[PDB]
Amino acid sequence: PTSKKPPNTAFRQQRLKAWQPILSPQSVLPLLIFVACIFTPIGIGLIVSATKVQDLTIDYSHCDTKASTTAFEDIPKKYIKYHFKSKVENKPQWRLTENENGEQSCELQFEIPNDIKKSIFIYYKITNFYQNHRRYVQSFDTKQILGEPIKKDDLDTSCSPIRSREDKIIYPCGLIANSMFNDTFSQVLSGIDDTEDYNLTNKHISWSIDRHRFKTTKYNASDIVPPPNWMKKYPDGYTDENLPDIHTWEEFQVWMRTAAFPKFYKLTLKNESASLPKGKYQMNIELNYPISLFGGTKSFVLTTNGAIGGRNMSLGVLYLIVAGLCALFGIIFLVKLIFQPRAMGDHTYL
Amino acid sequence: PRVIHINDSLANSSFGYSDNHISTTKYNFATFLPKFLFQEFSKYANLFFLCTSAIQQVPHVSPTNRYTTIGTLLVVLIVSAMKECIEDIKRANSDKELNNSTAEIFSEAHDDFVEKRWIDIRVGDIIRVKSEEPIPADTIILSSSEPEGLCYIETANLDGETNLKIKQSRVETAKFIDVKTLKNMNGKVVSEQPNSSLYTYEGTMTLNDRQIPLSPDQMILRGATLRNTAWIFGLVIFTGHETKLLRNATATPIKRTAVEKIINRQIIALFTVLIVLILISSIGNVIMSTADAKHLSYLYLEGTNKAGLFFKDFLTFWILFSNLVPISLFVTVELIKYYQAFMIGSDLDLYYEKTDTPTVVRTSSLVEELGQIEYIFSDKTGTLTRNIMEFKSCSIAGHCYIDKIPEDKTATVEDGIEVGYRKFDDLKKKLNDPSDEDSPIINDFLTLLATCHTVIPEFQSDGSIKYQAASPDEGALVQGGADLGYKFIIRKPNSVTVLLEETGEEKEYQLLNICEFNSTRKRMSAIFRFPDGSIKLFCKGADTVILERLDDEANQYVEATMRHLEDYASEGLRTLCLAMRDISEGEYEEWNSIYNEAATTLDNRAEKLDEAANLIEKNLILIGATAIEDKLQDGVPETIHTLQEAGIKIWVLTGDRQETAINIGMSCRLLSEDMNLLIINEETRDDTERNLLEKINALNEHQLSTHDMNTLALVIDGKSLGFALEPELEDYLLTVAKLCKAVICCRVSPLQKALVVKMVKRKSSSLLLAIGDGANDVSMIQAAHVGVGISGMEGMQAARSADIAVGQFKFLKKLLLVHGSWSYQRISVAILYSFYKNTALYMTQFWYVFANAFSGQSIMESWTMSFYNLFFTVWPPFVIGVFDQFVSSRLLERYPQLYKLGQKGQFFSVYIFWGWIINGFFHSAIVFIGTILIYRYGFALNMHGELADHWSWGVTVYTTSVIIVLGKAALVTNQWTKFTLIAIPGSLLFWLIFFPIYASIFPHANISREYYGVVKHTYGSGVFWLTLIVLPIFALVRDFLWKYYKRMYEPETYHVIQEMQKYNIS
Ligand SMILES: CCCCC/C=C\C/C=C\C/C=C/C/C=C\CCCC(=O)O[C@H](COC(=O)CCCCCCCCCCCCCCCCC)COP(=O)(O)O[C@@H]1[C@H](O)[C@@H](O)[C@H](OP(=O)(O)O)[C@@H](O)[C@H]1O
Ligand SMILES: CCCCCCCCCCCCCCCCCC(=O)OC[C@@H](COP(=O)(O)OC[C@@H](N)C(=O)O)OC(=O)CCCCCCCCCCCCCCC
Ligand SMILES: *[C@@H]1O[C@H](CO)[C@@H](O[C@@H]2O[C@H](CO)[C@@H](O[C@@H]3O[C@H](CO)[C@@H](O)[C@H](O[C@@H]4O[C@H](CO)[C@@H](O)[C@H](O)[C@@H]4O)[C@@H]3O)[C@H](O)[C@H]2NC(C)=O)[C@H](O)[C@H]1NC(C)=O
Ligand SMILES: Nc1ncnc2c1ncn2[C@@H]1O[C@H](COP(=O)(O)OP(=O)(O)OP(=O)(O)O)[C@@H](O)[C@H]1O
Ligand SMILES: *[C@@H]1O[C@H](CO)[C@@H](O[C@@H]2O[C@H](CO)[C@@H](O)[C@H](O)[C@H]2NC(C)=O)[C@H](O)[C@H]1NC(C)=O
Ligand SMILES: [Mg+2]
């Protein structure tokens, strides 16, 4: 019958070409030396690249209780964080303005004594805002933001706290698109005293995939109602002109992008292909979002995009830390090779 | 009582007796479900998953699908069931080869023997058995082709023996020759219940005339084999599992491995870690929801009592963190243990050439515990010896004659009297011419070697002469006398004709009287006449009884023969001294009367036959002594020595005599001529109790040293062990057995072979191994942790119910040292690497709850995390636990002490398990800290001011955690072959290609639509590529240095062997 003999292949008999790696003293020390000599220049380059970024964070919070209405008053030191190539002379200042009704505003006067040649970006920094909560990340009807007019019982359960109010559909349901930051920033840096204006824009600030997936709604103007927190600007429900399309509303798209940490930036304005000359500038911010809603800080950030975005030494330090571990152990292992003879072998304690 | 009819197949069916089938299978078609559930749910991870699936059924508390864990538990159960079904199908296919052998049955409606299978015999059918055919079932003999009715049955499978057992038939119930005239068998038989008490049978057959008693002298059991006969007629009494031998043997039990019992204790610690994490997360969530309740009004919480929220948070974080215990582990481990058991049974060094039966592993669950064996319980007849007796050396006139002179002594020394070795050609040349002084003595010795015996000759059809002897030593002596020149040819009452090679002349001796062999006399004597008119008497036997039978008065050839016997017995040769005497007829005229009066007493014949011969011993003329060796298998002493060098204590358990098991041990070098033999042969309980007490007292009075212990052996008798095994005071036998180098038990029942193993394994913490041959050591195989059986030779029941079936005993040297130390090292790391690789990823989910108000939001999604242990981190474990070897095979057989590394827990334990979990926490913490610092506020992109969000950051964490575990697998790998270059560096290239394709065609199909544009924000950036070089190196810089330090400045015993293999310098 069958021979029942196993084959003589190199696989069945377990005999294949191997390598057998041994961490010899002439293989680990040169490796560590090479790793250090490689990670030192890239470390220095990533460290110096974060110093070329000039930014100005002005915590405009507490404007309604610490700023005067008569004239401009100096801002405390615990609210300003500026990093420029040069050095400012006059400290930042701020003022509270009360116009008609109760729409108050904060006017911040700052200085740019550097003549920035990079593209300028303007974000706002929100602190202690848990946008990554488990019941907050997935809280929006994907088909409803796609332009399709969804029915009553066909909405997805993510919009669980707010969805239907007295047999009426809400166009932007969910936890998101309800707590949107509604502080309108001035679209121009008003130059004062021998300085010109600096025009800003809020177009093409969101992702290229958000402007392609946020379609104009096809809902009925008499079948939908605004969210509960959108009633101060959309009274008596929605009308024919009161229908905010999410295609051109790029602030809605930039806020719908859920962040990963409680401290996050959100792009509002930008200006490219133009330099920012030196001098005094003024920024007007309408106060509409109270900090008591989340118990954090509302800042105004004016930055320039660098190689890794903003001043962040966290990337260049690591490249210098590994080298600090390669020029240390790689040295204490070399002094143990010449000052402490090691036995060759043949000392098996069998 | 058990009643059985003689000749009918209609009434015996009303009793419901068992058939003649055997079932060595583990599972049956009516017990698969409960046994499989008890085997699978005996672990602590399957129960954990079953309890987890019961939590998702609670409403609201299940965030994901409700069939995410039970659907996977069903998959692992189906995989385990498929493996067990394949193993059981193979076992049943191996079993089927026994129930299909030929077996003739007598039919009443046919009046002729019909050839059937071994499964159709019922209780009470006439069976005709030929020569050299295994007995189908417990048959009482009824007829044979011999005068009065005689047959020789070899019971080498019932219990280890070498001599043929005599069996006969009753009077008036033995004339049933030929198939015809078998119709007048009417009546019934009453016997006792089936019991394993061998050598005992009581009952009576109620024939149509009167009753005929029974006895164990005509009761052939299943397992014996007819020898030197033609055919026998048997009536089946017991069958199937009712056989006295195959009674205590049960189905294959659930044998747990020491690795599984350690894993069970490793899962418990993971449960405490999980409970701590869940408690921390729940307390944090409750505190955050209670204290900071006014600063989280944008989430619209329900708002209930703290007691109603703590339970919900606990239930949620149960499923949220339930992935710390990997499900793919207990499936990969099964496939690894199944693949490494198939590679073992495909090695040419464990494959027999002259039989073509390679090694098989019919139990792939205990393949990894082959490198942790501390005790080996062997067997003599069939496992160590080849059951072949041959005439090796001879002693004549104080001179040793040997066919091939060895190199230990070679020539003689001639100190006082000649002592040494000389070739047989000298004997031939001295026998040729009659001018030598030892020619007549050698002549009489040669006539002794071919006359005084009970061997029956038979001329075959081809012309070869065959010998039939109930004792193999007598047959070996006859063959030696034949091939030496005196070929015994024909025998018939008062006639023995032997052909002489010289001159080609045949002789003729008138055999007058011959005394039978008894256990008390221990002699074989034969008195006859030579063709000249003189009476000569020969007598051969052991040197204990015949020394007091002769006196010294002229033959000064005694001390030389004593030295020769002492030199022969010091090697394991069964010796027999021989004596001749020439006496006249003046004493015979009354000797014939005093002998034949023993045939007149009709009351006690066994009392007169032995004393009738004890009257003709005045002064015997000692001729010399013989040597009959029992050949061992190929490479038996070397294997025993190698296994004793590796720290394994080898025992021997045989159901043979003590004298035959003593010299078996001096030949394979298990014993020596200088060790103290603690022989314990006691007849009562108090005797063996006092013997054990005085032995422990004599062994405790000394302080012991490097000697003393290596020269100590423990020989135990059958009934003495039965008294030393009782639960009342049994530690006295165990405290002394651990101080002897070797233990040998003799005349042990098949039940005691398992009792010894069960006593050793329950009063210690060592791993046992039971190797045996034949159906007499089957229960022992089913009593140890690893049961190895011998397949090929006489007897296969021990190889069908075992776990590994080898062909030779020497293979055990490579199955344990090479294929045992590897499987213990392969299955260890392959497990320890998984528990680590599942910790270095899912622990970031616990470091992230401090940044999302303790909500439990996952960093990655479901589909990406589901592919972690399925597509990208599944091949390194397989290539580590199957195709990896830390040392070459030629070095594991050179240094057996390395086996001790697997003998103690040096590669897999709970303390080492903490070293991989803590290392997994460190890497995950490093990844999390490095990722939350580079991505400050998402402002880590130089692409027109756009920022990175949640999903664009989770891809960096998932990619960084993949390079780290592959780096650890690379640092662990000791071989680096062609199968490794596709599992560690090929799995990294797989993810880097799979991610852009998956994240660009699947979000369009409404499947995981969160990766809509992350490929631009991850692959298109320069920061995502700068992190994958600085984080996996910063996280793996601690192991790369510690490995070098441990290999260089604190080298272990295997670190030097690995270095010896690299540079090839000893
Ligand atoms: C404040 C400033 C601090 C400055 C610190 C500066 C310097 C510190 C110096 C050293 C750091 C720590 C050093 C630890 C001290 C000694 C290391 C002992 C390493 C050790 O043998 O056992 C390991 C424990 O696994 C960790 O490695 C344990 C890793 C533990 C390291 C970190 C301990 C704390 C971790 C807590 C994390 C929690 C973070 C939580 C933070 C949350 C924040 C959000 C596990 O075995 P192993 O895989 O290495 O395998 C070894 C060996 O590598 C291998 O070559 C041998 O042969 P083979 O080649 O054939 O296999 C093999 O037989 C075996 O001997
Ligand atoms: C290039 C050549 C590469 C060849 C590589 C071959 C590798 C495969 C080679 C597969 C060899 C497998 C050997 C054993 C390895 C472990 C398998 C195992 O353990 O199986 C259980 C379970 C895992 O479940 P769990 O992870 O433990 O728990 C989930 C939990 N974390 C959660 O949240 O749900 O699996 C299943 O239940 C079967 C259904 C899987 C469906 C997903 C695959 C979709 C395929 C389709 C996915 C889309 C594919 C798109 C392809 C473009
Ligand atoms: C900018 O964003 C601010 C925070 O997102 C937002 O301030 C909130 O505005 C909403 C909308 O008016 C306020 O919600 C109302 O609160 C009052 C209690 O103070 C409720 O009574 C009221 O419900 C009413 O329900 C009545 C029937 O029971 C009925 O008359 C109406 O249906 C009415 O809705 C609202 O729920 C909320 O208190 C404001 N503060 C906070 C901290 O949320 C600003 O309005 C917004 N401004 C702009 C210009 O967008
Ligand atoms: N052909 C023979 N004629 C006489 N004596 C023999 C022959 N062959 C072997 N012997 C001797 O017979 C003796 C047998 O002693 P035995 O082995 O019978 O004691 P036991 O071991 O007490 O028997 P059991 O244990 O089987 O009841 C051995 O010492 C052996 O030398
Ligand atoms: C660039 O900035 C200037 C300065 O604000 C903008 O001019 C203003 O336009 C608004 C809109 O009608 C007027 O109400 C202001 O009075 C204008 N200010 C001045 C100083 O002229 C100008 O519109 C901006 N450009 C664009 C394209 O928006
Ligand atoms: Mg045997």
XYZ file of C-alpha atoms in Angstrom, chain B residues 777-1041:
265
model
C -0.375 -1.573 30.509
C -3.282 0.298 28.926
C -4.786 1.711 32.132
C -1.354 3.026 33.119
C -1.266 4.838 29.772
C -4.680 6.269 30.672
C -3.327 7.208 34.123
C -0.313 9.405 33.318
C -0.166 12.905 31.870
C 1.385 11.689 28.594
C 0.723 8.163 27.361
C 3.138 6.827 24.735
C 2.575 3.479 23.041
C 4.615 1.082 20.896
C 3.177 0.216 17.476
C 4.329 -2.393 14.980
C 5.406 -5.473 16.929
C 3.235 -7.999 18.773
C 0.411 -6.050 20.390
C -1.254 -2.829 19.261
C -3.888 -2.054 21.919
C -1.350 0.048 23.829
C -0.756 2.168 20.707
C -4.444 2.720 19.882
C -5.530 4.212 23.230
C -2.302 6.156 23.839
C -1.435 9.767 22.966
C 1.740 9.255 20.903
C 2.519 6.053 18.981
C 6.240 5.532 18.352
C 7.936 2.595 16.647
C 11.054 2.175 18.778
C 12.122 3.026 22.314
C 15.086 5.086 21.087
C 12.773 7.677 19.505
C 11.782 8.722 23.036
C 15.237 10.313 23.296
C 14.395 12.758 20.486
C 10.672 13.177 21.196
C 11.462 14.689 24.617
C 14.786 16.517 24.231
C 14.217 18.167 20.835
C 10.467 18.065 20.181
C 9.745 18.694 23.872
C 12.011 21.614 24.719
C 10.905 23.387 21.533
C 7.147 22.980 22.009
C 7.455 24.264 25.580
C 9.381 27.331 24.401
C 7.253 27.903 21.289
C 3.857 27.749 23.007
C 5.089 29.930 25.888
C 6.243 33.094 24.112
C 3.485 32.789 21.498
C 1.062 33.167 24.406
C 3.048 35.797 26.313
C 3.376 37.833 23.115
C -0.395 37.867 22.586
C -1.350 39.044 26.083
C 1.193 41.817 25.509
C 0.054 42.717 21.987
C -3.563 42.932 23.174
C -2.469 45.174 26.070
C -0.317 47.647 24.116
C -3.406 48.713 22.114
C -6.581 48.460 24.208
C -4.967 50.132 27.238
C -5.063 53.518 25.492
C -8.842 53.283 25.897
C -8.208 53.438 29.653
C -5.696 56.283 29.407
C -8.239 58.226 27.317
C -11.061 58.281 29.888
C -9.175 61.037 31.734
C -9.716 63.276 28.683
C -13.406 62.699 27.838
C -15.139 63.116 31.233
C -14.854 59.348 31.853
C -17.358 58.589 29.090
C -15.468 55.728 27.438
C -15.243 57.063 23.884
C -13.059 54.750 21.815
C -9.979 56.225 20.158
C -10.405 54.141 16.999
C -13.627 52.702 15.559
C -15.086 49.198 15.655
C -14.015 47.997 12.198
C -10.397 49.148 12.555
C -9.933 47.613 16.011
C -11.649 44.404 14.862
C -8.930 43.880 12.225
C -6.100 44.180 14.771
C -5.842 40.553 15.927
C -7.291 39.226 12.647
C -5.269 40.616 9.723
C -2.163 42.490 10.908
C -1.175 40.882 14.241
C -2.127 37.246 13.664
C 0.881 35.806 11.769
C 3.725 36.715 14.203
C 2.205 34.438 16.886
C 1.958 31.552 14.413
C 5.524 32.050 13.168
C 6.780 32.288 16.766
C 4.930 29.281 18.185
C 5.518 26.874 15.283
C 8.530 27.726 13.097
C 10.909 29.066 15.768
C 13.776 27.315 17.542
C 15.979 28.967 20.158
C 18.676 26.275 19.799
C 19.538 23.819 17.047
C 18.500 20.176 17.244
C 22.105 18.941 17.295
C 22.750 20.866 20.536
C 19.699 19.637 22.469
C 20.951 16.054 22.079
C 24.502 17.074 23.065
C 23.639 18.832 26.362
C 20.684 17.022 27.986
C 20.889 19.291 31.052
C 19.123 21.973 28.993
C 15.993 19.820 29.333
C 15.920 20.859 32.999
C 15.092 24.360 31.727
C 11.686 22.970 30.772
C 11.512 20.716 33.814
C 11.021 23.793 36.017
C 8.900 26.834 35.241
C 11.510 28.959 33.476
C 9.555 30.099 30.392
C 5.875 30.305 31.429
C 4.553 31.308 34.854
C 2.488 33.978 36.582
C 5.494 36.061 37.667
C 6.738 36.166 34.071
C 3.183 36.958 32.946
C 3.312 40.201 34.940
C 6.501 41.153 33.091
C 4.603 41.269 29.793
C 1.505 43.061 31.101
C 3.573 45.777 32.793
C 5.594 46.104 29.586
C 2.306 46.481 27.716
C 1.161 49.285 30.010
C 4.454 51.117 29.448
C 4.239 51.080 25.645
C 0.576 52.126 25.577
C 1.261 54.936 28.054
C 4.234 56.118 25.984
C 2.120 56.109 22.812
C -0.707 58.026 24.493
C 1.599 60.619 26.071
C 3.484 61.154 22.816
C 0.295 61.486 20.783
C -1.481 63.917 23.135
C 1.591 66.194 23.096
C 2.283 66.382 19.351
C -1.414 67.008 18.618
C -1.911 69.861 21.076
C -5.189 71.439 19.924
C -5.227 69.688 16.559
C -2.916 72.431 15.233
C -0.434 69.923 13.826
C -0.986 70.245 10.069
C 0.712 72.473 7.491
C -2.135 72.307 4.963
C -3.779 75.752 4.708
C -4.512 75.948 8.430
C -6.734 72.865 8.605
C -6.658 70.869 11.835
C -6.617 67.188 12.756
C -9.761 65.890 14.451
C -10.625 62.788 16.475
C -10.413 60.175 13.718
C -7.288 61.708 12.169
C -5.568 61.291 15.552
C -6.776 57.752 16.252
C -5.094 56.483 13.090
C -1.734 57.683 14.429
C -2.332 55.797 17.686
C -3.370 52.635 15.830
C -0.382 52.845 13.470
C 2.163 53.573 16.211
C 0.867 50.683 18.336
C 1.311 48.346 15.346
C 4.998 49.107 14.751
C 5.734 48.567 18.451
C 4.318 45.045 18.750
C 6.011 44.037 15.487
C 9.290 45.425 16.802
C 8.843 43.317 19.928
C 8.111 40.243 17.803
C 11.284 40.969 15.826
C 13.351 41.347 19.005
C 11.892 38.081 20.331
C 12.495 36.034 17.166
C 15.683 33.958 17.387
C 15.665 32.416 13.885
C 14.584 34.876 11.156
C 13.695 32.557 8.256
C 11.580 32.978 5.115
C 8.292 32.511 6.998
C 9.257 35.301 9.411
C 10.019 37.889 6.704
C 6.343 37.627 5.659
C 4.843 37.809 9.171
C 6.665 40.623 11.009
C 7.822 43.006 8.224
C 5.113 41.830 5.817
C 2.273 42.549 8.222
C 3.506 46.136 8.563
C 3.478 46.613 4.787
C -0.013 45.084 4.721
C -1.581 47.758 6.935
C 0.170 50.610 5.104
C -1.431 49.395 1.853
C -4.736 48.214 3.313
C -5.553 51.515 5.040
C -5.614 53.869 1.995
C -7.672 51.414 -0.070
C -10.090 50.599 2.759
C -10.598 54.242 3.763
C -11.404 55.308 0.178
C -13.914 52.728 -1.123
C -15.714 51.696 2.067
C -16.887 55.109 3.379
C -18.633 55.480 0.012
C -20.583 52.256 0.659
C -22.020 53.576 3.967
C -19.629 51.276 5.868
C -17.359 53.084 8.358
C -17.913 56.550 6.911
C -15.698 58.244 9.513
C -12.560 57.782 7.376
C -13.907 60.017 4.612
C -10.863 62.264 4.251
C -8.376 61.207 6.920
C -6.024 59.780 4.270
C -5.263 63.342 3.171
C -4.792 64.491 6.782
C -2.583 61.516 7.732
C -0.670 60.231 4.691
C -0.564 63.722 3.174
C 1.086 65.268 6.241
C 4.697 65.295 7.372
C 3.965 64.982 11.083
C 2.285 61.573 10.796
C 5.482 60.167 9.267
C 7.813 61.834 11.794
C 6.027 60.221 14.757
C 6.301 56.615 13.509
C 10.110 56.860 13.797
C 10.457 58.619 17.154
C 7.737 56.805 19.118
C 8.375 53.109 18.281
C 12.093 53.688 18.879
C 11.588 55.554 22.162
C 9.235 52.793 23.338
C 11.514 49.909 22.272
C 14.803 51.415 23.483
C 14.421 49.799 26.920
C 14.147 46.213 25.659
C 16.926 46.512 23.065
C 19.426 47.525 25.759
